[PDB]
Specification:
- By secondary structure, this protein is α/β, with parallel strands linked by helices.
- Strands 2-3-1-4-5 form a 5-stranded parallel sheet, with helices on both faces.
- The chain is 55% helix and 12% strand.
- Bound molecules: adenosine-5'-diphosphate (ADP), chloride ion (6 copies), magnesium ion and platinum (II) ion (PT).
- Adenosine-5'-diphosphate (ADP) binds next to helix 1 and helix 8.
Length: 165
């Protein structure tokens, strides 16, 4: 099982804390989005456009289930994975770290146009707040550890987790 599975909104730090936490532990980081693009060969966007939500989530759950069983390092879960009941079920029993972030800080951490589908240019703040209202209850439901990252620098978040593992 993974040493830790990181979940949270876009910009909460899943990729960043994931990479840094994995390095600290001397283990590897597996990003479900990356695993999906490498399993299929197509990009996230392409899968959504062609196949669409339902098909994506299905491929995603499949990748997530294999990761939870085969990966022993740090696992960073795609932000919408928890919307799938099957994923929430698969997570039961694992160490799940919910990286919490405010909407104001979250929207600002993701302003780099690093490909944020759900956060289209027009009124990103409103969209981000809506995303939070929808996803937060789910992250809270699957989390075994909650970590506020609002005023904590990345290294502090990593040390916080490391000390609790
Ligand atoms: N604790 C933090 N303090 C300051 N900036 C952070 C922190 N965590 C993440 N960030 C920054 O916010 C951006 C989004 O981080 P990222 O790991 O890609 O988030 P996610 O994978 O959850 O979408 C990155 O540029 C990252 O360096
Ligand atoms: Cl995300
Ligand atoms: Cl399973
Ligand atoms: Cl590993
Ligand atoms: Cl299960
Ligand atoms: Cl909000
Ligand atoms: Cl909130
Ligand atoms: Mg990520
Ligand atoms: Pt909120």
């Amino acid at each position: 099982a993974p040493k830790a599975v990181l979940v949270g909104l876009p910009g909460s730090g899943k990729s960043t804390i994931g990479r840094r936490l994995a390095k600290a532990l001397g283990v590897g980081l597996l990003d479900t989005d990356v695993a999906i693009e490498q399993r299929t060969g197509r990009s996230i966007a392409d899968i959504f456009a062609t196949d669409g939500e339902q098909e994506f989530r299905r491929i995603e759950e499949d990748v997530v289930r294999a990761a939870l069983a085969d990966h022993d390092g740090v696992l960073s879960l795609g932000g919408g994975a928890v919307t799938s009941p099957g994923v929430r079920a698969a997570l039961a029993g694992h160490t799940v770290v919910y990286l919490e972030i405010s909407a104001a800080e979250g929207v600002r951490r993701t302003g780099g146009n690093t490909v944020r589908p759900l956060l289209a240019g027009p009124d990103r703040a409103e969209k981000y707040r809506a995303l939070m209202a929808k996803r937060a209850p789910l992250y809270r439901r699957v989390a075994t550890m909650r970590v506020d990252t609002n005023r904590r620098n990345p290294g502090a978040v990593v040390r916080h987790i490391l000390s609790r593992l």
